[PDB]
């Protein structure tokens, strides 16, 4: 039902090996649709989904212009942050920015977000009211004062509530066959002895979209969360996702264990059994 548009930006300094590397990517839900890489030959915002290709030359020129502007800002930010934290030129550092908007099943605005990290830790984030900031440390308080005096929140709020949601709706419509689909997981469990006395039970979900899924093991109905190995949801490469969860159990107890799968494509949650 619900949908998101998100843009992800990463800038990495490269001490004495030239200017920072900048990578930008845009997603609708779990489907990438655009990229920019400062190191690439094209110097253009590039399509990465079939349904964005129909956008006109004004779109591509304007997105290239804007993404290059973001690239330059983040270049400046890396120097600013070195100053704020009194850091040297010896080391590489990383700035990350994420922003975007969520809509409900009825495609009306739910929430907006606009967040920044420096060296993998939260730096500054727009609050859920889109009017105020959370600054994670003293350096980010300096940014907060500057952004408050410059009325940055008001500019972002108008984008996140208006433009962001309008373009997300357009993408959802244009990319309807890709984006407004739900592929339910194809599920099974595998069994393999690891010794004469223990077996690995692995619960699989394959070929699903969107990526959000829950897989859990129970023993006589009790959740086995501390004993479960759960891997990160991974892309198949074809637009669908995969995930597994495993437990190692004593041989003969298989029938006590059940796997439980929750996904929006399922008419009901599934319970998989060894009997």
């Amino acid at each position: 039902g619900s949908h998101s548009m998100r843009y992800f930006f990463t800038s990495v300094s490269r001490p004495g090996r030239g200017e920072p590397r900048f990578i930008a990517v845009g997603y609708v839900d779990d489907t990438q649709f655009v990229r920019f890489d400062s190191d690439a030959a094209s110097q253009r915002m590039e399509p990465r989904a079939p349904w964005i290709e129909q956008e006109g030359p004004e779109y591509w020129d304007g997105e290239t212009r804007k993404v290059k502007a973001h690239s330059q800002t983040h270049r400046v930010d890396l120097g600013t942050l070195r100053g704020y934290y009194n850091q040297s030129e010896a080391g590489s550092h990383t700035v990350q920015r994420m922003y975007g908007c969520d809509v409900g099943s009825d495609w009306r605005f739910l929430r907006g977000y606009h967040q920044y990290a420096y060296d993998g830790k939260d730096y500054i984030a727009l609050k859920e009211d889109l009017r105020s900031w959370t600054a994670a440390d003293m350096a980010a308080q300096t940014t907060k004062h500057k952004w408050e005096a410059a009325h940055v929140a008001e500019q972002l709020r108008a984008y996140l509530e208006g433009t962001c949601v309008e373009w997300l709706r357009r993408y959802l419509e244009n990319g309807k066959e890709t984006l407004q689909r739900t592929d339910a997981p194809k599920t099974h469990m595998t069994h393999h002895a690891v010794s004469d006395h223990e077996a690995t039970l692995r619960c699989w979900a394959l070929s699903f979209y969107p990526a959000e899924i829950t897989l859990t093991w129970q023993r006589d109905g009790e959740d086995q969360t501390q004993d479960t190995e759960l891997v990160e949801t991974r892309p198949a490469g074809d637009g669908t996702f995969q995930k597994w969860a495993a437990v190692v159990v004593p041989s003969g107890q298989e029938q006590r264990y059940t796997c439980h799968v929750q996904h929006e494509g399922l008419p009901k949650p599934l319970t998989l059994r060894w009997e």
Binding site: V76, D77, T163
Partner: peptide, 9 residues
């Protein structure tokens, strides 16, 4: 569609 305004840290 990207945001079109710039803001420095």
């Amino acid at each position: 569609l990207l945001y079109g305004f710039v803001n420095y840290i």
